DNA sequence: CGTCCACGTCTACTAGACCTGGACGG
């Protein structure tokens, strides 16, 4: 559930549902504290887009669909285990907490938002989270400007490894990407963030925040979410150079999140 | 049986909380 996997997921939904027509209600598992989706239509299509660590679904009634319904948008955050699967209607995984059902001509499938630990959330209304910065994958220059226009922000007083998690500037970067990013430039994870960014007012740190997650999108698959057996899991593991790898150091940032790295921890290291 | 760890917010006062399950230890 970092930016690459959000992106992959929206693109899986678009592709797998290209030719599906959904129908009926949208069903929530009972265990879920996320809201019920009040949405019913006899014939609708589902599409998606990603932004950072969020994804939006649009549910779009076809012409003449009943009952009446204007398109509806839902935005999802994946937590630590969210994902989407398309499965046979009677063979629902768990823990499929939100389900959309295909309509008759065809084998009965379900598009499921599947989330074991349940840190995922969805919101009615199709709005990106206020406060999240632009997507490092799809909004690169806006991302770069928002970081650079805002270096006085106290966010940047922190270690570069911590600032990379801050979704107000690095929307889409998570724990694995930060290790990978920093590793490509040997930037110690505990250099002050502002010092590493001030250089900018061969690729630099802000370019890698885009181009590194992009690499993962280009592997295709499920990225970090991909299961061992794993044709795509072995890919992702083979792509990783630093995160969890033998040889590397690791330390806890101040929020208890592990940062992996090689070499100098950097001036601000908890000591 | 256990303890620890995981791709991330979220919110009540920088810790806990929120969850399941895999790996490994005894």
Specify whether the backbone of A160 is left (phi greater than 0), alpha (psi in -120 to 50) or beta: alpha
* A6 lies in the same domain as A121: yes
What length does chain A have? 271
Q: Residues of A annotated as binding site for DNA?
A: 175
A237 and A202 within one domain: yes
C-alpha–C-alpha distance, residues A115 and A230, integer Å: 19
Residue A240 in tokens: 């990783």
Question: What is the domain-level CATH number for residue A120?
Answer: 3.20.190.10
Enter the tokens of residue A118: 């349940």
Same domain, A33 and A158: no
Q: How far apart are alpha carbons A161 and A141 in whole angstroms?
A: 21
Residue nearest to nucleotide B5 (CA to C1'): A258
Question: Domain residues for A170?
Answer: 133-262
Structural tokens at position A11: 């693109």
Give the separation between CA A9 and CA A84, rounded to whole angstroms: 6
Give the CA distances from residue A155 to residues A14, A133, A162, A165, in Å, rounded to whole numbers and listed in that order. 36, 13, 9, 10
**A37 with A67, same domain?**
yes
Helix axes A3-16, A205-219, angle to 10 degrees: 40
Q: Which two tokens stand for residue A107?
A: 């084998």
Question: How far, in Å, CA of A43 to CA of A166, rounded?
Answer: 40
**Single residue among A99, A132, A165 that ends a domain in this structure:** A132
Q: What gap in Å lies between CA A183 and CA A222, rounded to an integer? A: 22
The encoded tokens of residue A180 equal 């990978």
The C-alpha atoms of residue A226 and residue A232 are separated, in whole angstroms, by 6
Closest CA to A189 of A244, A261, A271: A261
Q: Which residue has the tokens 């270690």?
A: A159
Active-site residue flag, A2:
yes
CA of A76 to C1' of B17 (A): 21
Residue A145 lies in a domain: yes
Whole-Å CA distances, A84 to A50, A176, A198, A202, A222: 13, 20, 39, 37, 10
Distance of alpha carbon A49 from the chain centroid: 11
A237 touches strand B (CB under 7 A): no
Residue A68 burial (CB count, 10 A): 9
Whether cis (ω within 30° of 0) applies to the bond prior to A95 is yes
Angle between helices A231-239 and A205-219 (to 10 degrees): 160
Assess whether A76 (CB) lies less than 7 A from strand B. no
Is residue A79 domain-shared with residue A4, that is, in the same domain? yes
A146 within 8 A of A133, measured Cβ to Cβ:
yes
CATH number, domain with residue A167: 1.10.8.50
Amino acid A172 CA to nucleotide B1 C1' distance, rounded Å: 39
Is A53 found in the same domain as A12? yes
A166 and A236 assigned to the same domain? yes
Scanning the structure block, which residue is given the tokens 């499929």?
A: A96
Do residue A6 and residue A107 come from a single domain?
A: yes
Considering its fold, how many domains does chain A have in total?
2
> How many other CB atoms are there within 10 angstroms of residue A174's CB atom?
22
Q: Looking at the structure, tell me whether residues A99 and A154 fall in a common domain.
A: no
A186 classed as catalytic: no
Claim to verify: residue A72 and residue A192 sit in the same structural domain: no
Task: Please indicate, yes or no, if residue A154 is contained in any of the structural domains.
Answer: yes
**Cα torsion through A14, A15, A21, A22, rounded to 10:** -60
Say if residue A25 is in the same domain as residue A142.
Answer: no
Q: CA–CA distance from A121 to each of A63, A96, A155, A173 (Å)?
A: 30, 13, 25, 18
Give yes or no: residues A53 and A126 share one domain.
yes
Q: Which pair of structure tokens corresponds to residue A157?
A: 């007083």
DSSP chain A: --HHHHHHHHHHHHHHTTT--EEEEEEE-SS--SPP---EEEEEEEEEEEETTEEEEEEEEPTT-SS----EEEEEE-TTT-EEEEEETTS--TTEEEEEEE-SSS--EEEEEE-SS---EEEEB-PPPTT---BTTT-HHHHHHHHHTTTTSGGGGSBHHHHTT-TTTSBT--HHHHHHHHHHHT--TTSBHHHHHHTT----HHHHHHHHHHHHHHH-S-GGGPPTT-HHHHHHHHH-SSTT-TT-EEEE-TTS-EEEESS---TT---
Q: Are A9 and A55 in contact (CB under 8 A)?
A: yes
């Amino acid at each position: 559930p970092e930016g690459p996997e959000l992106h992959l997921a929206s693109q899986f939904v678009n592709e797998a549902c290209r030719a599906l027509v959904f129908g009926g209600c949208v069903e929530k598992s009972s265990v879920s504290r996320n809201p019920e989706v009040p949405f019913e239509s006899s014939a609708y299509r589902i599409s998606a887009s990603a932004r950072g660590k969020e994804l939006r679904l649009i549910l779009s009634p076809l012409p003449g669909a009943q009952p009446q319904q204007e398109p509806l948008a839902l935005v999802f955050r994946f937590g630590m285990s969210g994902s989407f699967q398309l499965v046979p209607r009677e063979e629902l995984p768990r823990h499929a907490h939100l389900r959309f059902y295909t309509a008759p001509p065809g084998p009965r499938l379900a598009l499921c938002f599947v989330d074991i630990r349940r840190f995922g959330r969805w919101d009615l209304g199709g709005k990106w989270q206020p406060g999240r910065g632009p997507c490092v994958l799809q909004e690169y220059q806006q991302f770069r400007e928002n970081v650079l226009r805002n270096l006085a922000d106290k966010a940047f007083d922190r270690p570069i490894c911590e600032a990379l998690l801050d979704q107000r500037f690095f929307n889409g970067i998570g724990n694995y990407l930060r290790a990978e990013i920093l590793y490509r430039l040997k930037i110690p994870p505990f250099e002050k963030a502002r010092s590493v960014l001030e250089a900018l007012q061969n690729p630099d740190l802000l370019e890698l925040c885009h181009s590194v997650p992009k690499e993962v999108v280009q592997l295709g698959g499920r990225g970090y979410g991909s299961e061992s057996g794993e044709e795509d899991f072995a890919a992702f593991r083979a792509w990783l150079r630093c995160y969890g790898m033998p040889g590397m150091s690791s330390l806890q940032d101040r929020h208890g999140r592990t940062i992996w790295f090689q070499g100098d921890p950097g001036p601000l290291a908890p000591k």
